Scaffold this active site. Structure first.
Site, PDB file in Angstrom:
ATOM      1  N   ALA A  48       0.791  -1.094  -0.100  1.00 30.46           N
ATOM      2  CA  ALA A  48       0.035   0.110   0.026  1.00 30.46           C
ATOM      3  C   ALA A  48       0.864   1.330  -0.029  1.00 30.46           C
ATOM      4  O   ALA A  48       0.500   2.245  -0.408  1.00 30.46           O
ATOM      5  CB  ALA A  48      -0.902   0.128   1.158  1.00 30.46           C
ATOM      6  N   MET A  49       2.021   1.043   0.439  1.00 32.95           N
ATOM      7  CA  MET A  49       2.796   2.377   0.561  1.00 32.95           C
ATOM      8  C   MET A  49       3.602   2.873  -0.828  1.00 32.95           C
ATOM      9  O   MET A  49       4.136   1.964  -1.382  1.00 32.95           O
ATOM     10  CB  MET A  49       3.944   2.284   1.494  1.00 32.95           C
ATOM     11  CG  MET A  49       4.619   3.522   1.592  1.00 32.95           C
ATOM     12  SD  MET A  49       6.154   3.557   2.911  1.00 32.95           S
ATOM     13  CE  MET A  49       7.383   4.485   1.512  1.00 32.95           C
TER      14      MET A  49
HETATM   15  C1  HEM Z   1       8.525   9.355   3.965  1.00 34.12           C
HETATM   16  C2  HEM Z   1       9.649   9.548   2.904  1.00 34.12           C
HETATM   17  C3  HEM Z   1       8.057   8.041   4.375  1.00 34.12           C
HETATM   18  C4  HEM Z   1       9.160   6.934   4.953  1.00 34.12           C
HETATM   19  C5  HEM Z   1      10.461   7.391   5.477  1.00 34.12           C
HETATM   20  C6  HEM Z   1       8.201   5.888   5.133  1.00 34.12           C
HETATM   21  C7  HEM Z   1       8.710   4.782   5.811  1.00 34.12           C
HETATM   22  C8  HEM Z   1       8.200   3.576   5.944  1.00 34.12           C
HETATM   23  C9  HEM Z   1       8.635   2.404   6.335  1.00 34.12           C
HETATM   24  C10 HEM Z   1      10.130   2.157   6.937  1.00 34.12           C
HETATM   25  C11 HEM Z   1       7.648   1.371   6.543  1.00 34.12           C
HETATM   26  C12 HEM Z   1       7.654  -0.130   7.097  1.00 34.12           C
HETATM   27  C13 HEM Z   1       7.365   0.206   8.744  1.00 34.12           C
HETATM   28  C14 HEM Z   1       7.588  -1.298   9.438  1.00 34.12           C
HETATM   29  O1  HEM Z   1       8.106  -2.043   8.869  1.00 34.12           O
HETATM   30  O2  HEM Z   1       6.950  -1.140  10.579  1.00 34.12           O
HETATM   31  C15 HEM Z   1       6.480   1.968   5.836  1.00 34.12           C
HETATM   32  C16 HEM Z   1       5.218   1.340   5.752  1.00 34.12           C
HETATM   33  C17 HEM Z   1       4.046   1.895   5.218  1.00 34.12           C
HETATM   34  N1  HEM Z   1       4.218   3.142   4.637  1.00 34.12           N
HETATM   35 FE1  HEM Z   1       5.445   4.688   4.702  1.00 34.12          FE
HETATM   36  N2  HEM Z   1       6.976   5.955   4.659  1.00 34.12           N
HETATM   37  C18 HEM Z   1       7.018   7.414   4.286  1.00 34.12           C
HETATM   38  C19 HEM Z   1       5.758   7.801   3.515  1.00 34.12           C
HETATM   39  C20 HEM Z   1       4.589   7.397   3.492  1.00 34.12           C
HETATM   40  C21 HEM Z   1       3.343   8.000   3.031  1.00 34.12           C
HETATM   41  C22 HEM Z   1       3.604   9.364   2.318  1.00 34.12           C
HETATM   42  C23 HEM Z   1       2.434   7.106   3.013  1.00 34.12           C
HETATM   43  C24 HEM Z   1       0.945   7.282   2.701  1.00 34.12           C
HETATM   44  C25 HEM Z   1       0.569   7.465   1.204  1.00 34.12           C
HETATM   45  C26 HEM Z   1       2.966   5.795   3.465  1.00 34.12           C
HETATM   46  C27 HEM Z   1       2.050   4.688   3.817  1.00 34.12           C
HETATM   47  C28 HEM Z   1       3.020   3.492   4.348  1.00 34.12           C
HETATM   48  C29 HEM Z   1       2.081   2.341   4.396  1.00 34.12           C
HETATM   49  C30 HEM Z   1       0.386   2.152   4.027  1.00 34.12           C
HETATM   50  C31 HEM Z   1       2.812   1.426   4.980  1.00 34.12           C
HETATM   51  C32 HEM Z   1       2.545  -0.225   5.349  1.00 34.12           C
HETATM   52  C33 HEM Z   1       2.582  -0.937   4.216  1.00 34.12           C
HETATM   53  C34 HEM Z   1       2.461  -2.350   4.324  1.00 34.12           C
HETATM   54  O3  HEM Z   1       2.821  -2.979   5.494  1.00 34.12           O
HETATM   55  O4  HEM Z   1       1.659  -3.262   3.687  1.00 34.12           O
HETATM   56  N3  HEM Z   1       4.241   5.881   3.688  1.00 34.12           N
HETATM   57  N4  HEM Z   1       6.519   3.316   5.586  1.00 34.12           N
END
Ligand code: HEM
Ligand SMILES: *Cc1cc2c(cc1C)nc1c(=O)[nH]c(=O)nc-1n2C[C@H](O)[C@H](O)[C@H](O)COP(=O)(O)OP(=O)(O)OC[C@H]1O[C@@H](n2cnc3c(N)ncnc32)[C@H](O)[C@@H]1O
Ligand SMILES: *Cc1cc2c(cc1C)nc1c(=O)[nH]c(=O)nc-1n2C[C@H](O)[C@H](O)[C@H](O)COP(=O)(O)OP(=O)(O)OC[C@H]1O[C@@H](n2cnc3c(N)ncnc32)[C@H](O)[C@@H]1O
Ligand code: HEM
Ligand SMILES: [Cl-]
Ligand SMILES: [Cl-]
Lengths: 75, 515, 515, 75
Positions: A48-49
């Site tokens: 989803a991300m």
């Molecule tokens: C901003 C540049 C940004 C970062 C940095 C980031 C990181 C990140 C990580 C490290 C994870 C994994 C976390 C874990 O393992 O616990 C993760 C996961 C998701 N993200 Fe993200 N993310 C950044 C930005 C964004 C934005 C702007 C959104 C929304 C449009 C977003 C969304 C998500 C989602 C949903 C996940 C979960 C995915 C899954 O487990 O299926 N992130 N992010």
């Protein structure tokens, strides 16, 4: 710097989904997430991300946001 | 090892060397790891089908002109993106495997924001988040309009695909004024009043003189937009967001018919939304797994239950009033009177909804405050699968009910859910349906691909076509509008891009076609 | 003895025989007496300069397709007109001497008027008078928007030139939705949702999918419009027209700056007008001869006197409010408060104005009631001489004042009057100047021609260009917008009309040009 | 008929300028204006007055309006 600081990148981009009160993505604050993992998730995207090219979020900003997030207390 | 269609490694190598000479090595990306972020897609097909051969980042008009010159010399097709957040429509990946991505994200200057004439002139890489910050820091009395991706999306990119927002300025292309594009031959063309030397009305008067071409460039591949102007709504004294909750799926008929006159008279001036139960749920961050793991679509009994436990209705309407306190009060009386006379619908005010979701994110989008709350839709089933099926409809109750039933039937056939909302204009509806599926599941992915095909087929049989679509289906949708249209589009293509270097395949326009 | 440019008598004769076989003798006009009515012009040049070689009247799409086939066969250039009442812009005469006029006045069917979705679909020959009668006879709850020629003019022709009206739907092209054109190759193209078989949203959603081309056809010669749809304003419960009279020429600055916010917030929703003393006088049917026969422009002392004797001001503003009584009252308070705070302007209500002119004709135009009262402008000096000089301007007080001074200087140099009005949009002004002269006077006619040329030159030096212009100056005005634009326009021309048969010269687009 | 009657042509076209209360053009009612003169003025146009092609106002309609106007009393 592209985003000035890790906190600013978090506030303007990542936090819109990841801040505790939003809940679109999992909490990253105070989770001890390694920089390599953060860069990997951001560059490849993850289910989803969405992914972000370096033109949007460069490597230096990722290093910064990784350190900023690690420095915060776990919510 | 990805190369553009019909381009040899030798010719590609020459083009890459020239891009480096022109842009600098740091602005020419050819390594797999540098390209992976551009390849992330939510469409039911493997990444390879939309893998770019390279990406180049430009920051000036002169560099863009240099890029097209090189592209024409070696017949290199380029796919242009601005902020590249086109989720559900192909994201940042090219329409055809092997195209070079012209990434304009770094060409991000806000050229001008006039707080009196109320307009902005920006470059492609400008994001709504960037503009929101600029407007707040400078305390400018204007507001923005934007898609839910708001903060990370941008006006140029969104408007080039004729996207929509939720304030009275929600019809983005309608509020666009003045555009600059680099044509395939390198010429820099400005629409409207832009071509007049010393002109100060480029963002003032749309049409200019002679053929007015801004529309010809939107959803097309006849030029590369490098600047775009658009009008901004003056910040009103009072903003009053509200919601009306309806309990039955069948109410959509009476809801739409009662709403139409209010929109038509401009008493309710913004692009209203009527969200189905599952769109509401996803936006409020509920997931299917919280209610069931049974295969197939989410049972109507689970949905009726969800409504029972949350207060969400079969349809959840969000709208707003703007103006002075007096104008808002007069209009609120008219609106409440309509719903009271209807005898259906629970009105929810801001004081009542308070700081709760999804009222909060809705109120923010309707007032130009960014947030990404709606991305909760991607957590309904998760897995990264999402395609927008967005048929156009008359803003007539019976039509909207007919489309909902058709879509629901086809979605269920493939084990997927009807997750939708009607974006309401005075006469039309952007009937937005999020086809959500687990893209990490091969079997479900194949079902989503077949489902999308069937939705297009079934809707077309009833005279309905979508207003915008993901890259995997842009040629298929072009077919919906007939051969005469496509023939004319290819004649224009031949005239402005004889070498077919500008995003061939965009909207089904490709000189390789027999048109 | 008029023949199309580059067409021999022999080739013309073959085309005429084919036009007769296709349309019938009664629909092919080649005799001088049949053509003289199409030759009537108000431009400062002899009739011969715009004399047509013939005229053909078609009533069906199939006949129009047949006409272009014949035109391509014998390289016959055709100038298309719908209702042909383009006074001040060339009327019904062709842009170049010798063209065949394709007169669509008889193709006058009102195809549809939907009173619920509020739109109309019509053919070229439909007039506003015809539509008004239809709406009243059927008691349809909708209203029209139109140029002053109203009753005799028509929506297709006016919109193809991007004309304007005086209600909230005054920006005609903006409210246009769906268009059908016959292309030079005979293909029948429908924009928007029109190409979708079984579609019911042609007059519902503007853009369609892929490039949206309606704009490309307006003020252009890329196709012949045979059908056009447009949105209609629902008839409101209350209509409140009003006027505000200002005494000094210099007030235009504060008038426009105080008005802008009201238009921008939509508190005053219609295309407001701010008419200068002589425009007001002409519309009220006063003539220069009643006040003086002195040579040159009308002396400022004669004008100050006129104001003294009539009550007209240096600037006369006409606007209106629409909606329920409550909405109108709330907005009336806001408007009157603005002018009271301004400390200038005498407000005149309908109750006070009564059935007097020009208040009556203004109130009617602002509510879609036809009348030709404003043709009194042609009696100011009489003689049949009139050209519209219509520069675009920011709706900023200082800009409007600057333009008025510039125009007045050039007009006076040539012994003519500043007769103008600002048609007000939220951000732009169509600064409409009627260059009036006695066309029966050779010397004055030469002065008017030189004056128009100088108005274009002088305004262009300050970065101002016109939004529309008469046929004698369409090439000159195209120059104002630059070579890149013209080059693009000619590439498209070559692609959709290789034989250059569609109105070559329209907006300066002619394959005989070196572009 | 293209306009049905001379009075209808007058009401829908000519009158918008010529009726006494309007005054854009001179009064034509009860002026004994010959049909030949009316056709000439309409076909050629006349200074401030526009011309009308037969496709807009045919000969038969001009005959009718000429007779109608002549039958009215002079204002
Ligand atoms: C901003 C540049 C940004 C970062 C940095 C980031 C990181 C990140 C990580 C490290 C994870 C994994 C976390 C874990 O393992 O616990 C993760 C996961 C998701 N993200 Fe993200 N993310 C950044 C930005 C964004 C934005 C702007 C959104 C929304 C449009 C977003 C969304 C998500 C989602 C949903 C996940 C979960 C995915 C899954 O487990 O299926 N992130 N992010
Ligand atoms: C995930 C999501 C997406 C979404 C939405 C809700 C959610 C949860 N709600 C939307 C809405 O309310 N309104 C709307 O219009 N879209 C909505 N979306 C889909 C999408 O994410 C947004 O539309 C986003 O704003 C689109 O992304 P972006 O704004 O970043 O624009 P882009 O990707 O750069 O460009 C889009 C397409 O336009 C063409 N293009 C772009 N730049 C150019 C230039 N410079 N020249 C020529 N063509 C250009 C391309 O075809 C590009 O793919
Ligand atoms: C004399 C006068 C004129 C006038 C006005 C006040 C007075 C006293 N006030 C105007 C106003 O308020 N707003 C405005 O837009 N114009 C005003 N005018 C000028 C004019 O008379 C009107 O604009 C009139 O409505 C224009 O005439 P009409 O409506 O009859 O349109 P047309 O002559 O048929 O067509 C105009 C041009 O469009 C192109 N053309 C027309 N039909 C087609 C088709 N079917 N396909 C392709 N192109 C077409 C031609 O270039 C044509 O000349
Ligand atoms: C309707 C088809 C129509 C007719 C018939 C008509 C006739 C007409 C005549 C015979 C005259 C001359 C009268 C005389 O010599 O005393 C005349 C003059 C003018 N007209 Fe006319 N006219 C018809 C229609 C219209 C319309 C719709 C307008 C307004 C746009 C109009 C205007 C005028 C004007 C002005 C004149 C006087 C011209 C001058 O002396 O400069 N007519 N008309
Ligand atoms: Cl996608
Ligand atoms: Cl003219």
């Amino acid at each position: 710097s592209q985003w000035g600081s890790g906190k600013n990148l978090y506030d303007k981009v990542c936090g819109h989904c990841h801040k505790p009160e939003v809940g679109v993505g999992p909490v990253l604050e105070g989770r001890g997430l390694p920089e390599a993992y953060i860069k990997d998730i951001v560059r490849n995207g993850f289910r989803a991300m969405p992914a972000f090219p370096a033109s949007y979020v460069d490597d230096e900003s990722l290093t910064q946001v990784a350190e900023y997030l690690s420095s915060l207390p776990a919510p | 090892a990805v190369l553009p269609k019909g381009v040899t490694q030798g010719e590609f190598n020459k083009a890459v060397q020239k891009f480096r000479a022109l842009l600098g090595d740091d602005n020419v990306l050819v390594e797999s790891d540098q390209l992976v972020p551009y390849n992330k897609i939510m469409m039911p097909v493997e990444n390879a089908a939309h893998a770019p051969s390279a990406a180049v980042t430009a920051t000036t008009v002169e560099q863009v002109q240099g890029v097209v010159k090189i592209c024409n010399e070696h017949k290199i097709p380029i796919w242009t993106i601005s902020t590249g957040r086109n989720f559900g429509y192909g994201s940042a990946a090219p329409v055809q495997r092997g195209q070079v991505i012209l990434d304009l994200k770094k060409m991000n200057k806000i050229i001008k924001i006039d707080p009196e004439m109320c307009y902005a002139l920006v470059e492609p890489g400008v994001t709504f988040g960037q503009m929101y910050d600029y407007i707040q820091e400078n305390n400018l009395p204007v507001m923005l309009s934007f898609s839910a991706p708001s903060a990370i999306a941008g006006p140029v990119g969104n408007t080039m695909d004729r996207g929509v927002g939720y304030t009275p300025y929600g019809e983005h292309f309608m509020m666009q004024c003045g555009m600059e594009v680099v044509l395939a031959n390198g010429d820099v063309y400005r629409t409207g009043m832009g071509g007049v030397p010393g002109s100060n009305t480029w963002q003032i008067f749309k049409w200019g003189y002679g053929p007015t071409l801004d529309g010809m460039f939107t959803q097309a591949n006849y030029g590369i937009c490098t600047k775009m102007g658009f009008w901004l709504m003056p910040k009103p004294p009072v903003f009053k967001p509200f919601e009306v909750i309806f309990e039955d799926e069948a109410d959509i008929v009476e809801i739409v018919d009662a709403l139409r006159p209010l929109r038509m008279s401009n008493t309710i001036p913004n692009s209203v939304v009527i969200a189905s139960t599952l769109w509401e749920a996803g936006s409020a961050h509920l997931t299917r797994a919280q209610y069931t793991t049974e295969p197939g679509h989410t049972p109507d009994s689970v949905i009726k239950q969800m409504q029972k436990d949350t207060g969400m209705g079969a349809w959840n309407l969000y709208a707003a009033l703007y103006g002075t306190q007096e104008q808002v009060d007069v209009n609120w009386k008219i609106v409440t009177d309509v719903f009271k006379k209807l005898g259906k619908g629970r009105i929810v005010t801001q004081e009542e909804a308070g700081d709760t979701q999804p009222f909060k994110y809705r109120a923010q989008l309707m007032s130009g405050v960014p947030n990404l709350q709606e991305f909760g839709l991607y957590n309904w089933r998760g897995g990264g699968g999402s395609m927008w099926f967005a048929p156009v409809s008359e803003a007539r109750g019976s039509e909207c009910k007919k489309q909902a039933a058709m879509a629901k039937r086809v979605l269920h056939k493939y084990g997927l859910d009807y997750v939708a909302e009607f974006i309401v204009a005075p006469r039309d509806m952007h009937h937005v349906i999020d086809v959500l599926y687990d893209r990490t599941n091969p079997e479900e992915t194949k079902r989503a691909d077949a489902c999308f095909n069937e939705l297009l087929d079934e809707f077309e049989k009833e005279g309905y076509a979508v207003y915008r679509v993901n890259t995997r289906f842009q040629d298929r949708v072009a077919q919906s509008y007939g051969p005469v249209k496509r023939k004319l589009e290819h004649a224009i293509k031949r005239a402005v891009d004889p070498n077919n270097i500008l995003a061939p395949g965009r909207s089904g326009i490709d000189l390789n076609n027999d048109f």
